[PDB]
């Protein structure tokens, strides 16, 4: 089993966007020690204690050469996506 990637070392390569097929997709790059599991979560705005990210890519990792693609579904309304310390406000249509 992998350690969790250092949450300080992510950058957006593709910011959260609609996939076409009713999911949210994104891509990150990671500059730290590999390989590792990506810490990804999301919250409804104002409700920081309950994860709402439903991961379609279930155990996303940074491998020694690849990784960084993440796909998820989010509940309707105003959310915040986190990849490590990376944060993105996201409105999910009903």
């Amino acid at each position, epitope marked *: 089993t992998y350690t*969790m990637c250092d949450k300080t070392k992510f950058a957006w390569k593709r910011t959260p966007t609609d996939s076409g097929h009713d999911t949210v997709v994104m891509e990150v790059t990671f500059s730290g*020690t*590999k*390989p590792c599991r990506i810490p990804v979560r999301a919250v409804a705005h104002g409700f920081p204690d309950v994860n709402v990210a439903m991961l379609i890519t279930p155990n996303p990792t940074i491998e020694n050469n690849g990784g960084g693609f993440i796909e998820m579904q989010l509940p309707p309304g105003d959310n915040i996506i986190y990849v490590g310390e990376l944060s993105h406000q996201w409105f999910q249509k009903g």
Partner: antibody
Amino acid sequence: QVQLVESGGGVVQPGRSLRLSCAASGFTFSNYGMHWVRQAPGKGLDWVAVISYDAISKSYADSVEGRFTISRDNSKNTLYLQMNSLRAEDSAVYYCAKSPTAIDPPFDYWGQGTLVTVSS
Amino acid sequence: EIVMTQSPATLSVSPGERATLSCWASQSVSSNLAWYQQKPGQAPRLLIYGASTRATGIPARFSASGSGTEFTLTISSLQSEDFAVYYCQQYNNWPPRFGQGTKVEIKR
């Protein structure tokens, strides 16, 4: 001012166990990764183990896997290393080292080390 | 699984001269490479991280470069406190392994 103070070293007979601790002060301990590194007399630096800031992630050198356990107590600012089944080859100065980030090296601050001697 | 090798084993140079130390990785470690200084009887001190960035409190005569599999640490105008052992360390891949060290001594 960052300080790291190791303790628990001493003489231990082969096959037996020893717990080291490292008392941290002068920074927010619970924000960073912490490592152990060891150095046998006259030899080089030898990374031993890591624990992430939130204690969820741990990793070990192949030479100690299955025999050593790293843990930490964020409420007490203390890092631990449980060393079981010790061998002569584990004799070394054991250093407590801090990460500037959540888990990764490099090691921005080091303690003075505690001496472990595995001998009869 | 990544072997770090330093060269030379011992470098002998005079006060005020330049010392150039090499660190080789058996596979690319991108820029995730650190250098440390260790004086006899003391704990190590971080000098360089990210292959070329000086750590805090490190003076300008220490500089370092490289990427991939070859790295260099250069100590310009060696001063008395500069003579020590230097270690590199790759942290691109778990586990983050040290080189065996290069001793910099005074040539007289």
